[PDB]
Amino acid sequence: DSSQGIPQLVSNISACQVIAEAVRTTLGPRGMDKLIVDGRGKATISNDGATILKLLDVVHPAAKT
């Protein structure tokens, strides 16, 4: 599992775009809310950027940065 060069950077570029798109509509006071569900079924409705990323838990390393 290895890859380098120009296309490797595109995987990290397009991967970081998905994290932003997940919390793109939460910026501002009138931003949209998001729903995340854990294994217990508890649904949390909120527009806090720090709470969204704390529960998403993306395995991709570029998103963890």
Binding site: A22, T25, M32, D33, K34, L35, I36, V37, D38, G39, I45, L56, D57
Partner: peptide, 12 residues
């Protein structure tokens, strides 16, 4: 008001 403000569902 609670449903229109939610536009994405995510669960592992």
């Amino acid at each position: 008001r609670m449903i229109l403000k939610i536009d994405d569902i995510r669960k592992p």
